[PDB]
Amino acid sequence: ARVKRGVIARARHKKILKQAKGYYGARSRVYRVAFQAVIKAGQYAYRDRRQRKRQFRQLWIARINAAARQNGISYSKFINGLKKASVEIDRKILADIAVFDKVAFTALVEKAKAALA
Amino acid sequence: VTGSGKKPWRQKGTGRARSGSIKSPIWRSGGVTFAARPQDHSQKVNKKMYRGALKSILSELVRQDRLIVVEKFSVEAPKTKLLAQKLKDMALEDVLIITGELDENLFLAARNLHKVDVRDATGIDPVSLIAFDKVVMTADAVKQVEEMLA
RNA sequence: CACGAAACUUGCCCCGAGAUGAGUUCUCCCUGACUCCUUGAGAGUCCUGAAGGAACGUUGAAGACGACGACGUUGAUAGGC
RNA sequence: CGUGACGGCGCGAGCAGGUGCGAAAGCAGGUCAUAGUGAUCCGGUGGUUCUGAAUGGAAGGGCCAUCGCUCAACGGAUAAA
RNA sequence: CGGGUAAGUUCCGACCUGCACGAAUGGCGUAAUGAUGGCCAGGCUGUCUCCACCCGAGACUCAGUGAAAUUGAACUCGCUGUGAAGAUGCAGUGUACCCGCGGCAAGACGGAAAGACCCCGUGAACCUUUACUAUAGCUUGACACUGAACAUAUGUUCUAACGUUGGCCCCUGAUCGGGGUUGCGGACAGUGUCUGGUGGGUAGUUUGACUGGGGCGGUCUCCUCCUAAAGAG
RNA sequence: ACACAGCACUGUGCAAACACGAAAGUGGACGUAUACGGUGUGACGCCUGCCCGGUGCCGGAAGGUUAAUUGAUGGGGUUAG
RNA sequence: GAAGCAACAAAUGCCCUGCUUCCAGGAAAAGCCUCUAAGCAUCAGGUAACAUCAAAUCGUACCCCAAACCGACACAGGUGG
RNA sequence: GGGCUAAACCAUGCACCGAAGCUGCGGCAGCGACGCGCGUUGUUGGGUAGGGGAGCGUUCUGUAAGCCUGUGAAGGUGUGCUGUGAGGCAUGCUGGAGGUAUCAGAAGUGCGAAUGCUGACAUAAGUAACGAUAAAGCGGGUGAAAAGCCCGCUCGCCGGAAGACCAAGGGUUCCUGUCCAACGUUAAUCGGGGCAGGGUGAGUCGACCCCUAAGGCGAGGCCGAAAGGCGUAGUCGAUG
RNA sequence: CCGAACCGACUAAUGUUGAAAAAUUAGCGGAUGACUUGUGGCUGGGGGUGAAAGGCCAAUCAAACCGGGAGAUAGCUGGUU
RNA sequence: GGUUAAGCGACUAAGCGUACACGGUGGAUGCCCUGGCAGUCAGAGGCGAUGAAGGACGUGCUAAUCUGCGAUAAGCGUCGGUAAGGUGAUAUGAACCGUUAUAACCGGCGAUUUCCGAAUGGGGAAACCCAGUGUGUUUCGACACACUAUCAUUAACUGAAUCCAUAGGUUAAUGAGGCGAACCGGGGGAACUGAAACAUCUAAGUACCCCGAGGAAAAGAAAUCAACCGAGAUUCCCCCAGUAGCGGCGAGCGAACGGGGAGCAGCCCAGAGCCUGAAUCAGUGUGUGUGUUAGUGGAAGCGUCUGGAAAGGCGCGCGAUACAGGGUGACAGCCCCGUACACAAAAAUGCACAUGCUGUGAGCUCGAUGAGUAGGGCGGGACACGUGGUAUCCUGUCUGAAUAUGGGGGGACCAUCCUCCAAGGCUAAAUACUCCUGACUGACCGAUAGUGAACCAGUACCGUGAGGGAAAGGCGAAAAGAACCCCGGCGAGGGGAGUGAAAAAGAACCUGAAACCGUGUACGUACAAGCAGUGGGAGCACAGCUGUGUGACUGCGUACCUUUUGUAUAAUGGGUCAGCGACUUAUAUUCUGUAGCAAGGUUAACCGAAUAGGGGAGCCGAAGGGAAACCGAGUCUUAACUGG
Ligand SMILES: [K+]
Ligand SMILES: [K+]
Ligand SMILES: [K+]
Ligand SMILES: [K+]
Ligand SMILES: [K+]
Ligand SMILES: [K+]
Ligand SMILES: [K+]
Ligand SMILES: [K+]
Ligand SMILES: [K+]
Ligand SMILES: [K+]
Ligand SMILES: [K+]
Ligand SMILES: [K+]
Ligand SMILES: [K+]
Ligand SMILES: [K+]
Ligand SMILES: [K+]
Ligand SMILES: [K+]
Ligand SMILES: [K+]
Ligand SMILES: [K+]
Ligand SMILES: [K+]
Ligand SMILES: [K+]
Ligand SMILES: [K+]
Ligand SMILES: [K+]
Ligand SMILES: [K+]
Ligand SMILES: [K+]
Ligand SMILES: [K+]
Ligand SMILES: [K+]
Ligand SMILES: [K+]
Ligand SMILES: [K+]
Ligand SMILES: [K+]
Ligand SMILES: [K+]
Ligand SMILES: [K+]
Ligand SMILES: [K+]
Ligand SMILES: [K+]
Ligand SMILES: [K+]
Ligand SMILES: [K+]
Ligand SMILES: [K+]
Ligand SMILES: [K+]
Ligand SMILES: [K+]
Ligand SMILES: [K+]
Ligand SMILES: [K+]
Ligand SMILES: [K+]
Ligand SMILES: [K+]
Ligand SMILES: [K+]
Ligand SMILES: [K+]
Ligand SMILES: [K+]
Ligand SMILES: [K+]
Ligand SMILES: [K+]
Ligand SMILES: [K+]
Ligand SMILES: [Mg+2]
Ligand SMILES: [Mg+2]
Ligand SMILES: [Mg+2]
Ligand SMILES: [Mg+2]
Ligand SMILES: [Mg+2]
Ligand SMILES: [Mg+2]
Ligand SMILES: [Mg+2]
Ligand SMILES: [Mg+2]
Ligand SMILES: [Mg+2]
Ligand SMILES: [Mg+2]
Ligand SMILES: [Mg+2]
Ligand SMILES: [Mg+2]
Ligand SMILES: [Mg+2]
Ligand SMILES: [Mg+2]
Ligand SMILES: [Mg+2]
Ligand SMILES: [Mg+2]
Ligand SMILES: [Mg+2]
Ligand SMILES: [Mg+2]
Ligand SMILES: [Mg+2]
Ligand SMILES: [Mg+2]
Ligand SMILES: [Mg+2]
Ligand SMILES: [Mg+2]
Ligand SMILES: [Mg+2]
Ligand SMILES: [Mg+2]
Ligand SMILES: [Mg+2]
Ligand SMILES: [Mg+2]
Ligand SMILES: [Mg+2]
Ligand SMILES: [Mg+2]
Ligand SMILES: [Mg+2]
Ligand SMILES: [Mg+2]
Ligand SMILES: [Mg+2]
Ligand SMILES: [Mg+2]
Ligand SMILES: [Mg+2]
Ligand SMILES: [Mg+2]
Ligand SMILES: [Mg+2]
Ligand SMILES: [Mg+2]
Ligand SMILES: [Mg+2]
Ligand SMILES: [Mg+2]
Ligand SMILES: [Mg+2]
Ligand SMILES: [Mg+2]
Ligand SMILES: [Mg+2]
Ligand SMILES: [Mg+2]
Ligand SMILES: [Mg+2]
Ligand SMILES: [Mg+2]
Ligand SMILES: [Mg+2]
Ligand SMILES: [Mg+2]
Ligand SMILES: [Mg+2]
Ligand SMILES: [Mg+2]
Ligand SMILES: [Mg+2]
Ligand SMILES: [Mg+2]
Ligand SMILES: [Mg+2]
Ligand SMILES: [Mg+2]
Ligand SMILES: [Mg+2]
Ligand SMILES: [Mg+2]
Ligand SMILES: [Mg+2]
Ligand SMILES: [Mg+2]
Ligand SMILES: [Mg+2]
Ligand SMILES: [Mg+2]
Ligand SMILES: [Mg+2]
Ligand SMILES: [Mg+2]
Ligand SMILES: [Mg+2]
Ligand SMILES: [Mg+2]
Ligand SMILES: [Mg+2]
Ligand SMILES: [Mg+2]
Ligand SMILES: [Mg+2]
Ligand SMILES: [Mg+2]
Ligand SMILES: [Mg+2]
Ligand SMILES: [Mg+2]
Ligand SMILES: [Mg+2]
Ligand SMILES: [Mg+2]
Ligand SMILES: [Mg+2]
Ligand SMILES: [Mg+2]
Ligand SMILES: [Mg+2]
Ligand SMILES: [Mg+2]
Ligand SMILES: [Mg+2]
Ligand SMILES: [Mg+2]
Ligand SMILES: [Mg+2]
Ligand SMILES: [Mg+2]
Ligand SMILES: [Mg+2]
Ligand SMILES: [Mg+2]
Ligand SMILES: [Mg+2]
Ligand SMILES: [Mg+2]
Ligand SMILES: [Mg+2]
Ligand SMILES: [Mg+2]
Ligand SMILES: [Mg+2]
Ligand SMILES: [Mg+2]
Ligand SMILES: [Mg+2]
Ligand SMILES: [Mg+2]
Ligand SMILES: [Mg+2]
Ligand SMILES: [Mg+2]
Ligand SMILES: [Mg+2]
Ligand SMILES: [Mg+2]
Ligand SMILES: [Mg+2]
Ligand SMILES: [Mg+2]
Ligand SMILES: [Mg+2]
Ligand SMILES: [Mg+2]
Ligand SMILES: [Mg+2]
Ligand SMILES: [Mg+2]
Ligand SMILES: [Mg+2]
Ligand SMILES: [Mg+2]
Ligand SMILES: [Mg+2]
Ligand SMILES: [Mg+2]
Ligand SMILES: [Mg+2]
């Protein structure tokens, strides 16, 4: 029972090279190099599903800060004021409102200022 | 492998991986690392397990209605056409026929029918009893099998 | 508030606007027609072809090659004489 | 019961037999205690209700007591570097 | 110390305090000789001060042909730091438009060869010897081939075993061989088996470990104290 | 450095010592001590001192010790009695 | 199809396998010449002249200090007369 | 790092940022309870050496004289869907005759490394080099094409050789015609290249032959476990 | 003795993926001798041969090459889908 | 409106990247088998002086090579078979042969059979050189044929020293030699290695060298075992048993007795008499059977659909003692060749009978009963057994009995008893092997695999030589292998045309992967610093807000393997791709899972036609303790246990 490896080996190598499309040079052409590149891309993607949640919150906070200071209050006092007023809107939504509904955001700032006073 | 025992090149200095034999299984045309030898693949079956399996198989043939018992089964002449007609009358196609004594005319008439086999009771085997659609036994063969399996 | 050295910043010589922060000044040149489209710093055809450049040639106290300089009959660029 | 991976090594009341000292209760299985040591193999000597290659014996073997290594590189590769 | 030089760790001549000369593993001299070692001088010069120019063959350009070592992948800068402890690739920062061609070798711990030094392996080989164990050879005796007398194991004589790489004869056209004969040796010699000695001539091997690298030195088992952190270790 | 002519020691009486060779043989040599082998020294000149305890070689052979061989004597096993 | 001679110089080639001289003292066998033995005897055989026949077979091109041989090469090398 | 006289340090306080920690929402698995494989519940799930558990796929045997397939098999190449993964399924194009469910059975059963082995193809790079610095110039010819071939004139180089001729060694390289793929370090009409035909004439040259050297073999022989060793008579052996 | 052929190999430069796995160029030593060379022969691997360097014995030498014991062994390094 | 100013700003691509499309290169993959690999059942177990194996050179209508053959040269004669076609392959052509039986083809028996090679007339650098003698023949030049080696044995003749003799010499007859894969008997005989070093020991009487034989060899008819009962030559298999023992008592080595099987067979000389030619083998003839070497007959299918082609689909039939297998334009019981079955031999030959002929001796009686031997001393070797307390066997050396009223053995030795008869020999079967021939088979390979070799391979090539040693398979069903035209050098190469189902099947030919190299298009890219991705993300292009391609700008981010305390490491390994490349196999043993049976379980060899059935020889378990005798649910210890 001799087993030739060609058909199965070709499928495995092709599966990796398909995942390497778009990479530069040997990284999209040469199995040895493409395999390492596909593994590293997987490691980065695992890491960056966690990083993505950090980077977006960081972006929302920066935009809330700018919109709050346009209305005369810092980010840190604004958040504390909302919490004292029992408002549970999260930063993703606060940043959305800060860009698309400046009148509603001003109303939220006034609510935060009243709870702080 | 046919070839000489000469070291292909010296141990050190050439810049090649070290070689010792042209017959290394690493090399094209080299030996097979664990080359096969002729083998005996037969297994031991305990006597009582062989007989136990036969009794299990025959009992299942009865429950599945694949065992047909007849008083006699024979043909007048060693003619394939006669046995084909006889089997067509009894609505049989793929059948093992177990007789008490091997009728010479019956054995010859069945040779060229590829779905049909004819044995004496002493020559039954477990795979044949499972492999055929139906099993026809003469009353005489039934007794012989009973006595054989106690 | 004032003096104070071959060190520092200048003064002297050379490079230098790819200084993408791409600078300034002087001078020269080009002043047609039409069609299509998804309609815009859009595409195409016809007519036009400037100032200037390059190429080629004869060449150089310029030169590895490129580059740089001189000259091309309205001419001394090279050889000859 | 202690102490060791193990091979081992250590402490031990009490029981049987026989003994010394003491009037007796008692004490005595070496020495105030902790170093003073060498596995196995191979053989030596004495003992022995064991074994004894046809049988009776015997040889040889076993068992009990004991002897031979600065195998000191001291868990000791060889009789011999 | 003297000589030579402006200046001489070399050279030449001396001294004797010869670490550690010395008489055939020769001592001290020695004409001639040496692609032999050291030192000095004349001549000579691009050896040099200190390089310049020139003539040729490459290098450079064009046409034709057309290699090589190397190579994980590259979008392949400097600095200071960091860090498997000497960074193009990390951190911070500076600088930097894209791409050739001729040159130069400071770095890519550049290429080349599984470091030859050092250590390790209960690795190897060959060499040495008063390492161990053997052994060819050499040497000793006993018995065998191997006998006869006489005298006192020894000695003398004898011939018939045995030796003859003395003469002669034959096979025979033959400096081999064999046979015959004669002389000389002669129970000796030589050979077999056994045996003591000798035996680097030859062979197989051994020649420990710990260790602030290895060697050298010290150590290697047992007892007591301390280190030992108030149970043991 | 090796060789070298020269020098010395030493072995060798011829079937030479010595060497190749299980052996037969062959070289040494169709030579014969003015010859042949081994060893050291290294033209030539002037020379070459003392030590024989160690290791080797040579000679000695009275004694001590000692091999194979020989098998006195003693002891044991067996058992006719 | 003319002339097609002389003189002089001259080998490392020839005379010369000589001659002279020296010590290190310089193959073999046949062809060839000669002598006889056994033998043969006006035979054979020998010598000379003449005639006649035979002399087979294989090699023979080409390179040979080289591009053809030895160096893997149309290779700066090597190759006796 | 920029910069900072606080954006430094001390003290007190309240905010906020901040992790794959905790919480929220959805999903999977291990272990244990509790009930009837299911439910419920609690809890756990970073891992090298290594132990344990459960699987994917490949070739081959049976099931299989079955099933799929020229109305298009295997293989190749795309696309879509699908599972926690190894993977699976469908289908366009290519291909043009094989393939094989299920449940079992057996293994030459899975590759990126071993300075691994074989083949193919890169890089450096159109880079180094084109093999003695004796040297070329021109006219004519032939030709698709001429620096290199042929003819001519000139120039230069060797001439105790770079000339002539043998032995050895090689073996057709010799001559003529024809061809230019490959070979020739370029081109080639030329060649020691391809193809075809031709060419080597002996009594006297050489070999063979007669004769021997060193040496070899060697009837008998002598010697040796065997194989063999030595050698006599002889017989070979040129470099004579 | 001086110096070509011939036999060597002291110095320097070049070359070092060479023209060459030891050469080329300019110089250098011997050059009637212990000289050099052609052809053939003989000595064989613990063996040969060696004016001696462990030199040489077919580009191989402190034990040649080829085949075999043979998949020696590898407490080491690498690799292991 | 224009001018000026300030600010912002697309369109560039020398080249490069990613994606896609289409190609080139290359030869993976799949599919394929006139080649291998392993066996089973049979056959044959040799060939050679009557010249082998293996070669050289020849041989055709032939230039070469292969195959065949040998100057009678791809062949000649004859007897048989068979026949409508044929003159082997490359390989067409030419000239021919044949069709009812001398074409060809197949088989038996013959003929021919150069040269080298044991090589044999001498020599020799294999395939060449040179002879002697005798018969003939001759045209006087010469030609043909046959003999001529060595050694052994035998015989004849001859014949030394030397008188007889012997040695020696000549001749004749008969035999031998050389080659071949394994198996077999004998003469010699390693080391690596293991012992964690190494010397005893091991490896191992292995490898290797040598001599000799046969189809088998060897061994073999008790001076054997046993144990007081008995067995009854040798050989082979399964047990006994990894036991008893051996052993630097280390590493290791390792029986026998006894039991189950295969197979079975006994005889002769050492000597006379009687009786005789009687058994028995060998040879040679002849018969009868039975094989072997050529051969003969051998059943049964059409229509229609798809298609280049049908054997496939669908429909309806038929044969089968034949549905083994192969082929045919895709998959055929019925197209072809076969297959089952039934038949066949002029000639040669194997076997088993029969019957001749030849040799051989059968039986009875009475005798005889293997001496430098057994044994011993010394040195070695062999026995599982290493000198040990060491029996037994062999013998290099030195010795040395009794001989049937005797002798050998029973594991030191003695006694007793038992058993056997050495020093002479022959002998089938069961056993070992396969260069070679035929048939069949495979959970064996399928072109880097399987033989080194699927192919003109032990070749090319390498080496002085011994020796080493490749790569290289596939057009199509059929060559129908591309007439003719065009560019080109009367090229190479290509474009058309034509063939074909297909020509990206066109001979550099099935499929045609990857690395690698191009052309085209979309997007990006010339102020920009690093493992080249990942998270975010504008713009553009494309297809239907989404899907696809691209990716300005931006957060984070130093490859993989190995080895390490620890590697971005400037430590190791890899230029890339494709293919191959490493925990296996056998036996023993223990544990787990699972299945059967259960105080039992199970057979081995072997028998059997048997995957059945037989076979229980054995092995494990149901009892232990003790060194052992022994005792036994106990036993050992000790005088004995409160005990342990
Ligand atoms: K391979
Ligand atoms: K049937
Ligand atoms: K500017
Ligand atoms: K002028
Ligand atoms: K016994
Ligand atoms: K120790
Ligand atoms: K001396
Ligand atoms: K000198
Ligand atoms: K940085
Ligand atoms: K550099
Ligand atoms: K050691
Ligand atoms: K060595
Ligand atoms: K004597
Ligand atoms: K010695
Ligand atoms: K330390
Ligand atoms: K240190
Ligand atoms: K303490
Ligand atoms: K020397
Ligand atoms: K003098
Ligand atoms: K003198
Ligand atoms: K002395
Ligand atoms: K002395
Ligand atoms: K000629
Ligand atoms: K497909
Ligand atoms: K690799
Ligand atoms: K290139
Ligand atoms: K060339
Ligand atoms: K050219
Ligand atoms: K030597
Ligand atoms: K060689
Ligand atoms: K050797
Ligand atoms: K572009
Ligand atoms: K490709
Ligand atoms: K012959
Ligand atoms: K050994
Ligand atoms: K070891
Ligand atoms: K060792
Ligand atoms: K068929
Ligand atoms: K013994
Ligand atoms: K091979
Ligand atoms: K092969
Ligand atoms: K095709
Ligand atoms: K292709
Ligand atoms: K990024
Ligand atoms: K690695
Ligand atoms: K390491
Ligand atoms: K390390
Ligand atoms: K390194
Ligand atoms: Mg297969
Ligand atoms: Mg893979
Ligand atoms: Mg690619
Ligand atoms: Mg790609
Ligand atoms: Mg070897
Ligand atoms: Mg193979
Ligand atoms: Mg059974
Ligand atoms: Mg000044
Ligand atoms: Mg310039
Ligand atoms: Mg006291
Ligand atoms: Mg005390
Ligand atoms: Mg002992
Ligand atoms: Mg007894
Ligand atoms: Mg110790
Ligand atoms: Mg001075
Ligand atoms: Mg002085
Ligand atoms: Mg001295
Ligand atoms: Mg002296
Ligand atoms: Mg002295
Ligand atoms: Mg002295
Ligand atoms: Mg001296
Ligand atoms: Mg000299
Ligand atoms: Mg640094
Ligand atoms: Mg440089
Ligand atoms: Mg380096
Ligand atoms: Mg190393
Ligand atoms: Mg030694
Ligand atoms: Mg140490
Ligand atoms: Mg010390
Ligand atoms: Mg303590
Ligand atoms: Mg404590
Ligand atoms: Mg002599
Ligand atoms: Mg000296
Ligand atoms: Mg002269
Ligand atoms: Mg000629
Ligand atoms: Mg040339
Ligand atoms: Mg040349
Ligand atoms: Mg978080
Ligand atoms: Mg969490
Ligand atoms: Mg966790
Ligand atoms: Mg985990
Ligand atoms: Mg299948
Ligand atoms: Mg398949
Ligand atoms: Mg299946
Ligand atoms: Mg595999
Ligand atoms: Mg791969
Ligand atoms: Mg790996
Ligand atoms: Mg490499
Ligand atoms: Mg070019
Ligand atoms: Mg370059
Ligand atoms: Mg250049
Ligand atoms: Mg150049
Ligand atoms: Mg040239
Ligand atoms: Mg020229
Ligand atoms: Mg030719
Ligand atoms: Mg020519
Ligand atoms: Mg020609
Ligand atoms: Mg060319
Ligand atoms: Mg030619
Ligand atoms: Mg001889
Ligand atoms: Mg002889
Ligand atoms: Mg002669
Ligand atoms: Mg001659
Ligand atoms: Mg020399
Ligand atoms: Mg001179
Ligand atoms: Mg040898
Ligand atoms: Mg030395
Ligand atoms: Mg050499
Ligand atoms: Mg050696
Ligand atoms: Mg071995
Ligand atoms: Mg190995
Ligand atoms: Mg001969
Ligand atoms: Mg002859
Ligand atoms: Mg002759
Ligand atoms: Mg060992
Ligand atoms: Mg026999
Ligand atoms: Mg038929
Ligand atoms: Mg049909
Ligand atoms: Mg087809
Ligand atoms: Mg007898
Ligand atoms: Mg005896
Ligand atoms: Mg004896
Ligand atoms: Mg006895
Ligand atoms: Mg006994
Ligand atoms: Mg192959
Ligand atoms: Mg293939
Ligand atoms: Mg050759
Ligand atoms: Mg096909
Ligand atoms: Mg194709
Ligand atoms: Mg800038
Ligand atoms: Mg830009
Ligand atoms: Mg960059
Ligand atoms: Mg970053
Ligand atoms: Mg480290
Ligand atoms: Mg790190
Ligand atoms: Mg580092
Ligand atoms: Mg780096
Ligand atoms: Mg690295
Ligand atoms: Mg590594
Ligand atoms: Mg390493
Ligand atoms: Mg390392
Ligand atoms: Mg590397
Ligand atoms: Mg018991």
Domain positions in chain B: 1-149
Q: List B134's β-bridge partners, or say none.
A: B95
Distance CA A79, CA A84 (A): 9
Query: How many angstroms separate the CA of B148 from the C1' of C55?
Result: 113
Beta carbons of A98 and A91 less than 8 angstroms apart: no
Count how many residues are written for chain A: 117
Going from the Cα of A44 to the center of ligand 139, the distance in angstroms, rounded, reads 29
> Which positions of strand J lie within 7 Å of protein CB atoms?
17-20, 28-30, 38-39, 319-324, 443-453, 458, 467-471, 513-516, 531-536, 549-551, 555-556, 559-560, 574, 576-587, 595-597, 601-604, 609-616
Distance A54 CA to E169 C1' (A): 134
Domain ranges of chain A: 1-117
In the DSSP assignment, the letter for residue A5 is: -
Interhelix angle A31-70/A102-116, rounded to 10 degrees, is: 70
Closest CA to B133 of B47, B68, B46: B68
E strand bases under 7 Å from protein CB: 70, 72-75, 112-115
CA atoms within 13 A on the CB side of B141: 26
Centre of ligand 124 to C-alpha B41, Å, is: 39
Using the structure, give the distance in angstroms from the CA atom of B68 to the C1' atom of C45, rounded to a whole number. 97
Question: What spacing in Å lies between the alpha carbon of B57 and ligand 57's midpoint?
Answer: 103
> Chain B, 11-50: which CBs lie within 7 Å of strand I?
20-21, 23, 31, 35
* DSSP-derived secondary structure letter, A21: T
Cα A11 to Cα A14, A17, A18, A33, A42, distances in angstroms: 5, 10, 10, 17, 20
> Is residue B92 a contact partner of residue B136, using CB atoms and an 8 Å limit?
yes
Q: Which of A55, A64, A56 is nearest to A109 (CA)?
A: A64
Resolution (A): 1.5
Structure tokens at B1: 């492998």
Question: A23 vs A14, A43, A45, B65, CA distance in Å?
Answer: 15, 16, 15, 67
CA distance B135 to B98: 7
The answer to whether B59 touches B96, Cβ cutoff 8 Å, is: no
Contact yes or no for B73/B99 (Cβ under 8 A): yes
Residues less than 5 Å from ion ligand 51, measured at CB:
A 29
User: DSSP labels for B46-76?
Assistant: -HHHHHHHHHHHHHHHHHTT-EEEES----S
H/E stretch holding A103 reads: helix A102-116
Quickly give A116 CA vs J632 C1' distance in Å.
Answer: 102
Tokens of A15: 């599966």
Instruction: Report the distance from CA of residue A52 to the C1' of nucleotide C6 in Å, as an integer.
Output: 63
How far apart are the C-alpha atoms of A58 and A79, rounded to whole Å?
14
What is d(CA A80, CA A83) in angstroms, rounded to the nearest whole number? 5
Q: Give the list of residues 6+ apart from residue B1 with CB closer than 8 angstroms, or none.
A: B23, B29, B30, B31
Q: What distance in Å separates the CA atoms of residue A39 and residue A58, rounded to the nearest whole number?
A: 29
DSSP β-ladder status, B116-120 and B134-138: unpaired
For this PDB entry, the determination method is cryo-EM
B1-149 fold: Ribosomal Protein L4; Chain: A; (3.40.1370)
DSSP chain B: --S----SS-SSSSSSPP---TT-TTSTT---TT------------HHHHHHHHHHHHHHHHHTT-EEEES----SSS-HHHHHHHHHHTT-SSEEEEESS--HHHHHHHTT-TTEEEEEGGG--HHHHHHSSEEEEEHHHHHHHHHHT-
Rounded Cα–Cα distance for residues B60 and B54 (Å): 10
Give the number of other CB atoms < 10 A from CB of residue B70.
14
Q: Which residues of A63-98 are buried (b: 16+ CB within 10 A; e: fewer)?
A: bbbebbeebebebeebbebbeeeeeeeebeebbebb
> In what side-by-side order are the strands of the sheet with B67-70?
B67-70, B134-138, B95-99, B116-120
Alpha-carbon distance B136 to B118, whole Å? 9
| B146, two tokens | 């009973």
